[PDB]
Design a protein around this ligand. Structure first.
Ligand code: NA
Ligand code: NA
Ligand code: NA
Ligand code: NA
Ligand code: NA
Length: 1043
RNA sequence: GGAAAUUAGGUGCGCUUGGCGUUUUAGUACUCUGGAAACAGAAUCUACUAAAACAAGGCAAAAUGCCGUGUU
DNA sequence: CTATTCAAGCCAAGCGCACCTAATTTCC
DNA sequence: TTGAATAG
């Protein structure tokens, strides 16, 4: 049957709506659900990847320095340097002699923390911030007479500490100390100039951004040329050709020639510049003046500036003409004709200056050119600035039409069209379905990319199961991500409180309880300063409250063409003004004789109302002062493109992808989009539940509303004009009044089919990806009690924070948990006194320090004890963990990491009893082209679960896999507790959190199921991308994961 | 709507670093014991400094060495 | 078992290219 | 949101 497809593309969801194109009856509707592909996910990976390289290279830097000391025999395996103080050694080495153990440790400490190199350039006024820029500037003034080690030693004696925010210095500052130290220590130890050069190098040398990682990395490159070429784009007309450097000579000549060919001169002779004219212009003002003006070109062609038009212009109004960058950059230092008049050479210099990133590399590459350049010239060209970026065309494209630009008057696009050169496009004829590879090409956000890919896959599945639809209407989220979404919600709620407080203010002042039914009119009243905007006459609030029917909410721009139902297109005016106005703009109405005031008097009031705090909306201003003609089709097109349809870049890209696919394969499918503001208006007037608490079905419900919107536009012949623009087809009946507009769209009783629908499907995206986060980062120390139990040791930092009552609750509930309670009890009593004194306050340590300005100090009979920055306390008993004690030699206690992230769990049926084996991410090992589950770890866990060889393997469960526990179907979150056989799940049509809120249930919003002897039945279900359920069957547990 | 250019702003991918943070051990301080002091012993709580480890781990061999939390 | 509790690495500096938005000129 | 321990 012929149907209409509606799509609600969201951050997390894709809702589809399938309704009959004639019967208007809902065929099917459901939601596809998935994780938000927000940028922070990949950012975490890249951040961790970078962190590993830093730690690796820092270590490798040290090992090389130790190797240097080994080869010069200042360090051995027997040589001990434990009790040596680097700060004491580095200071002593600047003046006196050092031991081979004392001098070596000084060099090692320098090599470890070598400081910054790039920030050091510019000073910054200390705005009391802890930024690197301000800190470097701060230390520089303190190092005006002292070396780094001297300053650190002073801080170590005076403040008792060195490490922290203040320990940020320039690399050159450390190097300046190192040289001085090496200069003093040179005579005492047998070293050469190779030793001092090598160490200083090692101390300061770091890879550049264009050098990248070493030889092995898949993120690396072999040279600067390969590096830049892979990054740069390709030509528009020659896809196989790499783009040209932005500031090549022929590139700017191409730019300049286009400027001259676009010029129009009003004179007796030709209006377009002749060849010889452009030649003279190029030679006399373009190759002579860096920034060509309109006067110079006018003086050259012997006309006035006023006769010249069609030139590019800046925001100021000043004419903009192409600057010959390379020409003037080289001319300013070399005026030789051998170089300047060599276009090919200037091209090559431009390429080298742009591709390579350092003066030294420029010099070498320019020298390899074997041109007529002097070495003094080359070393001078290598310091030129601004050579960055690419041209959108290749040199092949530029050189091809360069003669055409000289001798003709056609610009680049005219010539390319004449030469039958069409921009690169992707063919979709060999495609059996809508591709998903092209998505990342025209996308900007990772969130949108996933939502688009899923949306396409939904469409492909729909057209496979239901056939091709005639109409596809799509809506996209207004938010770019969930963080932006919450921000919108907060702003919404804030405005709601303000308006609600405003209403309560009125009902308490006037006593009129009518105010709660006049919110929109009251909101307009305050926004218009109590004045009818069409008559500029005062609107008494008391009269508005008593007689609201005398004041009408009018639409500024008629919705028949504007399709705007928002607050921005609404004004509170007197009923007379709204009647006389009719279907016109304020401009069209106030210009007529039907009005009481002039448009100019109106325009003045609006502009002053649009300025200042609490001003009118900016969109309201553009509406109230609309001076274009409504009946013009071009004007109507702009309103539809803004308020009715969605013309955002992402939307257009996807919409073009679909239209191009259907066009190429000759498939008669009409694709369109719709603004969310209009669908919200429909949902509002069609009387849907304002509180969206039904769960995921709202996405599918929205899609049905969107699909219904498409149906309305095909039914009415007055909407045929607007419907044609939505489908973007080339080219009449129309909506004439406000009343006609309401009759068409506001049809609550005609959409009862949607609300009665109770057959929604749901599809949750299953995550089977190996090698995600294996474990939490935090390292934990352990202790053993008298019972022989191993206990986890936790830290309690930030004791002096305002809203931190962790210590307060800890002492009140379990004082014995503190390690301070057992060891050093005198300090504990000192803390208890502070705790007992501020029991009313949230954080006793906060209120204490907020008054005395002093912190809690360790007990000392001389009142000189150290400050307490954090407190250790015993946590839970150690169980599931990762033992990494071996990384710490002679450690008295275990050192562990916690939270072993589960990959999946395999359910076994063992002698009428359901059991399962938990597969951890740590248990999945990567190989060259595939991931394998550790067979030793699997059998081990299979033994720790009392699984027998007789047991029957049921199924494996990953995240968002559908599991049916005792007749109840859930979706899998993951293994919550391996030892206790507890897995966490969630509901399918809704979140369990919201499910409890609707039921007003105060229980903790987590569903934990226990797989034990009481467990009766376990079945694995699954869905397609549409949400159609089906049961599965398997023979053995999957061990090989292809990735 | 599309082509090129100028300016301003924005997004992503990738690269290069900085100073922190967690943990162990050692030293010191703090606490306890003895002593006239020196110092020794105990404790490992609190702080400071150094060295080392920091997703499990896998390559690599004198290296500005390399991979391991993303997408599909 | 249910109901409850705890806690989970972080800031700052620079660079390359790709893409997008807005404004301006020409043409297709 | 989620590993996972813990009181009852
Ligand atoms: Na490329
Ligand atoms: Na550059
Ligand atoms: Na008038
Ligand atoms: Na950027
Ligand atoms: Na807890």
């Amino acid at each position: 049957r012929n149907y209409i497809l509606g799509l609600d593309i969201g951050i997390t969801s894709v809702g589809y709506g399938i309704i009959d194109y004639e019967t208007r009856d809902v065929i099917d509707a459901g939601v596809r659900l998935f994780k938000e592909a927000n940028v922070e996910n990949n950012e975490g990976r890249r951040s961790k990847r970078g962190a590993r390289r830093l730690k690796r290279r820092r270590r490798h830097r040290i090992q090389r320095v130790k190797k240097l000391l080994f080869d010069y025999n200042l360090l051995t395996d027997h040589s001990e340097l434990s009790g040596i103080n680097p700060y004491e050694a580095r200071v002593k080495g600047l003046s006196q002699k050092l031991s081979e153990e004392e001098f070596s440790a000084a060099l090692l400490h320098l090599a470890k923390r070598r400081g910054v190199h790039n920030v050091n350039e510019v000073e910054e006024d200390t705005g009391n911030e802890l930024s690197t820029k301000e800190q470097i500037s701060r230390n520089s003034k303190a190092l005006e007479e002292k070396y780094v080690a001297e300053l650190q030693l002073e801080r170590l004696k005076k403040d008792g500490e060195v490490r922290g925010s203040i320990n940020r210095f320039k690399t050159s500052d450390y190097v300046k100390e190192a040289k001085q130290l090496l200069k003093v220590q040179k005579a005492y130890h047998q070293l050469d100039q190779s030793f001092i050069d090598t160490y200083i190098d090692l101390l300061e040398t770091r890879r550049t951004y264009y050098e990248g990682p070493g030889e092995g990395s898949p993120f690396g490159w072999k040279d600067i040329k390969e590096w830049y070429e892979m990054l740069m784009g390709h030509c528009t007309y020659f896809p196989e050709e790499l783009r040209s450097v932005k500031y090549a000579y022929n590139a700017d000549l191409y730019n300049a020639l286009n400027d001259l060919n676009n010029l129009v001169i009003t004179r007796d002779e030709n209006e377009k510049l002749e060849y010889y004219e452009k030649f003279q212009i190029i030679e006399n003002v373009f190759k002579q003046k860096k920034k060509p003006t309109l006067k110079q070109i006018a003086k050259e062609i012997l006309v006035n500036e006023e006769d010249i038009k069609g030139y590019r212009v800046t925001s100021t109004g000043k004419p903009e003409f192409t600057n010959l960058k390379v020409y003037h950059d080289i001319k300013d230092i070399t005026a030789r004709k051998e170089i300047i008049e060599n276009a090919e050479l200037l091209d090559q210099i431009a390429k080298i200056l742009t591709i390579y990133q350092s003066s030294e590399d420029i010099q070498e590459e320019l020298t390899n050119l074997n041109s007529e350049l002097t070495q003094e010239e080359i070393e001078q060209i290598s310091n030129l600035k601004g050579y960055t970026g690419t041209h959108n065309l290749s040199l092949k494209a530029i050189n091809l039409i360069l003669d055409e630009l000289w001798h003709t008057n056609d610009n680049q696009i005219a010539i390319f069209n004449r030469l039958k050169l069409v921009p690169k496009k992707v063919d979709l004829s060999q495609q059996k379905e809508i591709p998903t590879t092209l998505v990342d090409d025209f996308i900007l956000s990772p969130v949108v990319k996933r939502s688009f890919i899923q949306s396409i896959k939904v469409i492909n599945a729909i057209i496979k199961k239901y056939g091709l639809p005639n109409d596809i209407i799509i809506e996209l989220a207004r938010e770019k991500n969930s963080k932006d979404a919450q921000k919108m919600i907060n702003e919404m709620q804030k405005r709601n409180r303000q308006t609600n407080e405003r209403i309560e203010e009125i009902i308490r002042t006037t006593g009129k309880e009518n105010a709660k039914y006049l919110i929109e009119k009251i909101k307009l009243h305050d926004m218009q300063e109590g004045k009818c905007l069409y008559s500029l006459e005062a609107i008494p609030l008391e009269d508005l409250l008593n007689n609201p029917f005398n004041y009408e909410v009018d639409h500024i721009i008629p919705r028949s063409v504007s399709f705007d139902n928002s607050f921005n297109n609404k004004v509170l005016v007197k009923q007379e003004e709204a009647s006389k106005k009719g279907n016109r703009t304020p401009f069209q109405y106030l210009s007529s004789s039907d009005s009481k005031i002039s448009y100019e008097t109106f325009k003045k009031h609006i502009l002053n109302l649009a300025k200042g705090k609490g001003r009118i909306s900016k969109t309201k201003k553009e509406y109230l002062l609309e001076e274009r003609d409504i009946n013009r089709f071009s004007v109507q097109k702009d309103f539809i493109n803004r308020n009715l349809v969605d013309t955002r870049y992402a939307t257009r890209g996807l919409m073009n992808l679909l239209r191009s696919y259907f066009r190429v394969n000759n498939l008669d499918v009409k694709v369109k989009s719709i603004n969310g503001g209009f669908t919200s208006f429909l949902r509002r007037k069609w009387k849907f539940k304002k509180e969206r608490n039904k769960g995921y079905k709202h996405h599918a419900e929205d899609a049905l509303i969107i699909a219904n919107a498409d149906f309305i536009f095909k039914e009415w012949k007055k909407l045929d004009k607007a419907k044609k623009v939505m489908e973007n087809q080339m080219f009449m009946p129309e909506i004439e009044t406000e009343q006609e507009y309401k009759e068409i769209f506001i049809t609550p009783h005609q959409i009862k089919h949607i609300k009665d629908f109770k057959d929604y499907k749901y599809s949750h995206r299953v995550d089977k990806k190996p090698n995600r986060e294996l474990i939490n980062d935090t390292l934990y120390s352990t202790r053993k009690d008298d019972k022989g139990n191993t206990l986890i040791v936790n830290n309690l930092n930030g004791l002096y924070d305002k809203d931190n009552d962790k210590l307060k609750k800890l002492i009140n509930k379990s004082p014995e948990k503190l390690l301070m309670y057992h060891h050093d009890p005198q300090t504990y009593q000192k803390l208890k006194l502070i705790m007992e004194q501020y029991g009313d306050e949230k954080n006793p340590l906060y209120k204490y320090y907020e008054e005395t300005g002093n912190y809690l100090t360790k007990y000392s009979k001389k009142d000189n004890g150290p400050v307490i920055k954090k407190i250790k306390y015993y946590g839970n008993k150690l169980n599931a963990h990762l033992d990494i004690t071996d990384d710490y030699p002679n450690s008295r206690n275990k050192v562990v990491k916690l939270s072993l992230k589960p990959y999946r769990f395999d359910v076994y049926l063992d002698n009428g009893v359901y059991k399962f084996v938990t597969v951890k991410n740590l248990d999945v090992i990567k190989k060259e082209n595939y991931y394998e589950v550790n067979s030793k770890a699997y059998e081990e866990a299979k033994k720790l679960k009392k699984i027998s060889n007789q047991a029957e393997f049921i199924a494996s469960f990953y995240n968002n896999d559908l599991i049916k526990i005792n007749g109840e179907l859930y979706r899998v979150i993951g293994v919550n507790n391996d030892l206790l056989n507890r897995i966490e799940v969630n509901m399918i049509d809704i979140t369990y959190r919201e499910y409890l809120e609707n039921m007003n249930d105060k229980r903790p919003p987590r569903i934990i199921k226990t797989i034990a002897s009481k467990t009766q039945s376990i079945k694995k279900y699954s869905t397609d991308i549409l949400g159609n359920l089906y049961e599965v069957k398997s023979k053995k547990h999957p061990q090989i994961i292809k990735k």
